[PDB]
């Protein structure tokens, strides 16, 4: 289906304890392929997915130089933003950056995005048009002016709908065996009595790829959207994903309820029901 | 004003230590150190993106830097080697993008020498115009010649009747080597001043060739320090 | 990595004639491109600064173009004059490598000599000594000059406001040779 390339950057000031902590990670869909950590011994952009290792020394030299440049930019920005908000030098603060692009099945551009944060709150973000910025407060409006003058938007759009899309297609092709595969979910159901006249039915999906899945409960073939505990889709650690949905049911009326599973890997949506 | 770079030049023994100073009062986060060999471009040695951090450039080997303050970014040479003979340029900028370009220093010409007995000041001598030339072209060409100096860092200038002149002047693009094959050859630079036959054939006119030498700051001969060696000649109607 | 090249490294051009200086760079992801002037012994002087978005910049008789596609820039000098003679450096700035310089092109703008009169003259030292020098002068800008005990210097541009070229030779031998 639709694919994405995303880069995530966290910068955390450690006042009195030297340089700020810098963590950069690259994602194709929900798979990490590159990493930089300031506290790591390498001081290199490191491969984290098998299919990126066929990139030559030029790629690794370039991404190391460019990720270091982003680190240095974050180091300056932390000091600047500390000034804007008139905050003490003793206080530890966080800058978070995410940018990326989405492509369809054909591999053509769908959309691009960039968002910046300070202390886990919206600072400034590129708009859907990829030509203007939304500033959270007066401090971010100063950044917007400096980004408008430097033509950050025009150069970012050129990346998001050009470079970003091109390198995503290359990654997707090189990592074809893992990135463009579809594993359907192995499904089962568990039963947990809370008390008398009551019980929890939990609908499981394991070993599926990609992460995109829909678990919904029904009563007499009618969707029970409201009273449903839907846990966060989690990684298995082997490259697959896990999820469950749960509903509280009065004991005796287990047969009334069904769990629906929609996923790409399936040839037909599954419909589970509790069995002794 | 802008980036201030000290010193302007330095002659240093192989192994001796030197600290090049670079200051700017524009409050620039970014400061850089480049070096330039003869006939080549600038090569980034070290840089700093703010007070408290430094990062290696393209050719960091044999050099040390610090950035305690935003203002200062000194470059230190632990042990001077023949390859470290170069012109060093310091730079600063407000942003990484530098949309007004970098602010650059004047430059520091560094000469690394095996010993301080390999350095010599220039011997300057003025040559009077040919009578054949005067009779043929009705023009008088004076030739100045500085010989047996090292390093090549000198500045020649003609002075007519106490005042510096540029019209009718011609200096060599670079000095010539007295033993070209030798790696520590003493240099020789020439210059010409051309005036009218009438201006030369007049004893009221005084022509002086001044050669500024940039050298040192313990043998029986004169210590080769930063001197101004001159040579002069007067017109003659006879 | 960012590799800036300037071919040719040397260019001789007669006065009044238009000329082009070439710059190629390998990483077309750039902040801006810069052209510098360097006189012998002196520092750098910024001529033009082209932004990544911009296509060309113009400052008097100087015009510079930018093509990120091929990764090339050209500096056009109109109605060239001896004052334009210098080393010209091409510099490219980007996040990864920062301001990165090419090798440079040494430009010689030769004066147009209206009335050549080539002749080799012998000049006597001002101070009373046997010391003398041979002066070859009044030769056109096209002809060039090149034993260990004899030293011959390069030609230079003498503008007496009339113009003339001159080269000097000396030894510790007559001036008949060379």
């Amino acid at each position: 289906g639709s694919h994405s390339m995303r880069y995530f950057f966290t910068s955390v000031s450690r006042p009195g304890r030297g340089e700020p902590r810098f963590i950069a990670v690259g994602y194709v869909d929900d798979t990490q392929f590159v990493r930089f950590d300031s506290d790591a011994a390498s001081q290199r952009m490191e491969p984290r997915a098998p299919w990126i290792e066929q990139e030559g020394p030029e790629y690794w030299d370039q991404e190391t130089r460019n990720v270091k440049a982003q680190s240095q930019t974050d180091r300056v920005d932390l000091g600047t933003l500390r000034g804007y908000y008139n905050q003490s030098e003793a206080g530890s603060h966080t800058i978070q950056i995410m940018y990326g692009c989405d492509v369809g099945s054909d591999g053509r551009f769908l959309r691009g995005y960039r968002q910046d944060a300070y202390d886990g709150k919206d600072y400034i973000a590129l708009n859907e048009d990829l030509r203007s910025w939304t500033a959270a407060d007066m401090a971010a409006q100063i950044t917007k002016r400096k980004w408008e003058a430097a033509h950050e938007a025009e150069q970012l759009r050129a990346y998001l709908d050009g470079t970003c899309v091109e390198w995503l297609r290359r990654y997707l092709e090189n990592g074809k065996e893992t990135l463009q595969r579809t594993d359907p979910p192995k499904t089962h159901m568990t039963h947990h009595p809370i008390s008398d006249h009551e019980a929890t039915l939990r609908c499981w999906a394991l070993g599926f790829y990609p992460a995109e899945i829909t678990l919904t409960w029904q009563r007499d073939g009618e969707d029970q959207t409201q009273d449903t505990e839907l846990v966060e889709t989690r990684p298995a650690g082997d490259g697959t994903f896990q999820k469950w949905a749960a509903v509280v049911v009065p004991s005796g009326e287990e047969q009334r309820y069904t769990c629906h599973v929609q996923h790409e890997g399936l040839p037909k949506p599954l419909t589970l029901r509790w069995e002794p | 004003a802008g980036v201030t770079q000290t010193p302007k030049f330095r002659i240093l023994k192989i192994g001796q230590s030197m600290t090049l100073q670079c200051t700017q009062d524009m409050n620039h986060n970014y400061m850089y150190w480049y070096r330039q060999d003869p006939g080549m471009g600038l090569k980034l040695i070290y840089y700093s993106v703010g007070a408290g951090i430094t990062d290696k450039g393209e050719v960091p080997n044999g050099y040390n830097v610090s950035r305690s303050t935003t203002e200062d970014f000194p470059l230190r040479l632990e042990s001077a080697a023949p390859s470290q003979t170069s012109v060093y340029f310091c730079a600063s900028s407000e942003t990484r993008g530098a949309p007004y370009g970098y602010t650059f220093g004047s430059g520091t010409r560094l000469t690394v020498v095996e010993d301080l007995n390999k350095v010599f000041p220039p011997e300057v001598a003025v040559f009077e115009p040919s009578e054949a030339e005067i009779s043929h072209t009705q023009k008088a060409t004076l030739v100045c010649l500085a010989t047996g100096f090292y390093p090549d860092h000198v500045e020649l200038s003609w002075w007519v009747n106490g005042k510096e002149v540029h019209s009718g002047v011609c200096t060599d693009p670079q000095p010539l080597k007295e033993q070209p094959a030798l790696n520590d050859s003493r240099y020789a630079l020439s210059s010409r001043l051309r005036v009218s036959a009438t201006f030369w054939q007049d004893p009221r006119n005084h022509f002086r060739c001044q050669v500024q030498f940039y050298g040192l700051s313990t043998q029986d001969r004169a210590k080769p320090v930063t001197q101004i060696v001159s040579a002069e000649a007067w017109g003659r109607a006879d | 990595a960012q590799e800036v090249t300037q071919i040719p490294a040397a260019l001789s051009v007669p006065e009044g004639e238009n000329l082009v200086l070439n710059c190629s760079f390998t990483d077309s992801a750039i902040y801006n491109l810069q052209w510098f002037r360097q006189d012998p012994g002196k520092g750098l002087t910024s001529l033009l600064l082209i932004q990544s978005s911009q296509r060309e910049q113009t400052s008097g008789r100087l015009n510079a173009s930018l093509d990120k596609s091929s990764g090339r820039s050209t500096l056009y000098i109109a109605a060239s004059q001896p004052g334009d003679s210098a080393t010209y450096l091409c510099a490219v700035n980007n996040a990864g490598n920062m301001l990165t310089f090419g090798g440079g092109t040494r430009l010689m703008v030769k004066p147009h000599i209206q009335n050549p009169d080539p002749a080799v003259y012998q000049l006597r030292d001002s101070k009373s000594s046997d010391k003398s020098v041979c002066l070859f002068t009044d030769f056109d800008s096209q002809t060039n000059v090149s034993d260990s005990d004899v030293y011959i210097t390069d030609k230079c541009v003498l503008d007496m406001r009339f113009k003339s070229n001159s080269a000097v030779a000396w030894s510790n031998f007559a001036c008949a040779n060379a």
Partner: peptide, 9 residues
Amino acid sequence: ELFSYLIEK
């Protein structure tokens, strides 16, 4: 591949 046109805040 990373975005490289870095402007300070």
